[PDB]
Amino acid sequence: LTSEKFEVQTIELYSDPTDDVIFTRDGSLIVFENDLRPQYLTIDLEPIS
Amino acid sequence: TATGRCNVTYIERSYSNGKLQWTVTIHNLLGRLIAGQEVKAERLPSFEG
Numbered sequence: 001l002t003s004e005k006f007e008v009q010t011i012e013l014y015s016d017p018t019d020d021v022i023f024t025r026d027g028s029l030i031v032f033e034n035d036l037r038p039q040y041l042t043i044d045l046e047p048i049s
Numbered sequence: 050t051a052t053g054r055c056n057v058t059y060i061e062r063s064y065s066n067g068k069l070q071w072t073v074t075i076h077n078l079l080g081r082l083i084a085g086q087e088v089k090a091e092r093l094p095s096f097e098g
Binding site for chain 2: 002003004005006007009
């Protein structure tokens, strides 16, 4: 089957590293920014007494 | 195609019918393009356009 019945072009692919730390290699260049795509970073908190 | 070969700096692809529509970006043209043309990548054998 082929693409017509499919909708979106760019799909965020989700993965869980076995590693705490992430390794940039070649054109593998990590980025964080928020305003453009917020949906990746979420900070939450519990106030304490 | 028959008419010639030229290189694309990048493509965007947008939606018609749900098949994406690649819109590439090229430098120049060898030969007169045609709606139908027999397409192959200069660099890649695998792909077909």
